[PDB]
Specification:
This is part of a larger assembly, with two copies of chain A (145 residues). With 145 residues, the first copy, chain A, is mainly beta. Chain A is built from two helices and eleven strands. In chain A, strands 1, 2, 3, 4, 5 and 8 form a six-stranded mixed β-sheet that branches. A three-stranded antiparallel β-sheet of chain A has the order 9-10-11, with no helix packed on it. In chain A, a hairpin with a 2-residue loop joins strand 10 and strand 11. The relative contact order of chain A is 0.21. Bound molecules: 2-acetamido-2-deoxy-beta-D-glucopyranose and calcium ion (2 copies). The site of one calcium ion has 4 residues of chain B, from loops. The PDB classes it as endocytosis.
């Protein structure tokens, strides 16, 4: 069970697509719960689920849509270990694709520094790149970066 | 069958659910042969349970003007989804006692003549009831067909 997020400009927000070993397929909204979404953000290294958006808000998914329904405890590391329950085929359509917005949305990089690990801090927000202010920037911030 | 009871009306079962969405033509001899989603596959819970009321389900009560159930009144028996009276022929003291003890009114009892008012003039289901010594319930006493 390999999940991924597509169709989103935000780094940790997009439409849910689960790979069943070889094929990529979308997930219907009625088959996704809060516990399953929390596992998906954790597996994708995005931290915490913020919202669950149905109706193909992030992007009209293509390909097949699986009728598998996730019955998730909530503490599973991956979607693969989470028990699921099959359903009769053809239950859901394309217009009800599930979307997930996780927490880790900020993107920061270091540029123009000769070393890849050293450089001025640049942060992208509202569709533009810019340089972070030095004021109130200290060693604790630097270590996390 | 006369009724198919749902929503755990009869009771709540603790065992795991074995079948889901049973579709049967009604003529198959064994319950297994009917179509289902899969053996041991389910999406319900224990709160949903299936009950059945068969044709030969018998209950006993006394009908009176004041109350539907009373310690004195007309004797009624329930069979094949219908209520029926019982004839007075071959009536015995032991049979009267067994009727009273089954419904928890008294130990012995007595037969009073017919009252002035009778409800709906329901038919007779059984006649010539002869009760031996020993059976607490009326179902064990021989009678006419
Ligand atoms: C059984 O079905 C009959 C016929 O529909 C109905 O009158 C009766 O109320 C039902 N009994 C129960 C207990 O559901
Ligand atoms: Ca079902
Ligand atoms: Ca059926």
């Amino acid at each position: 069970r390999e999940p991924r997020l597509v169709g989103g400009d935000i780094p940790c927000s997009g439409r849910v697509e689960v790979k069943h070993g070889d094929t990529w397929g979308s997930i219907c909204d009625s088959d996704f719960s809060l516990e399953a979404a929390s596992v998906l953000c954790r597996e994708l290294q995005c931290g915490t689920v913020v919202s669950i958006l149905g109706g193909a808000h992030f992007g009209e998914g293509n390909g097949q849509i699986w009728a598998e329904e996730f019955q998730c405890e909530g503490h599973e590391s991956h979607l693969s270990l989470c028990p699921v329950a099959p359903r009769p085929e053809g239950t859901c359509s394309h217009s009800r694709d599930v979307g997930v917005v996780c927490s880790r949305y900020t993107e920061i990089r270091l540029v123009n520094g000769k070393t890849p690990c050293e450089g001025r801090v640049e942060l992208k927000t509202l569709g533009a790149w810019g340089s972070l202010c030095n004021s109130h920037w200290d060693i604790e911030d630097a270590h996390v970066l | 069958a006369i009724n198919a009871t749902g929503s755990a009306h009869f009771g709540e079962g603790t065992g795991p659910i074995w079948l889901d969405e049973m579709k049967c033509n009604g003529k198959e001899s064994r319950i297994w042969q009917c179509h289902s989603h899969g053996w041991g596959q389910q999406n319900c819970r224990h709160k949903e349970d299936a009950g059945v009321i068969c044709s030969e389900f018998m209950s006993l009560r006394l009908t009176s003007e004041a109350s539907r159930e009373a310690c004195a009144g007309r004797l009624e028996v329930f069979y094949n989804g219908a209520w029926g009276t019982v004839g007075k022929s071959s009536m015995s003291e032991t049979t009267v006692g067994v009727v009273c003890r089954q419904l928890g009114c008294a130990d012995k009892g007595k037969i009073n003549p017919a009252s002035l008012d009778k409800a709906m003039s329901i038919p007779m289901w059984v006649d010539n009831v002869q009760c031996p010594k020993g059976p607490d319930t009326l179902w064990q006493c021989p009678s006419s067909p």
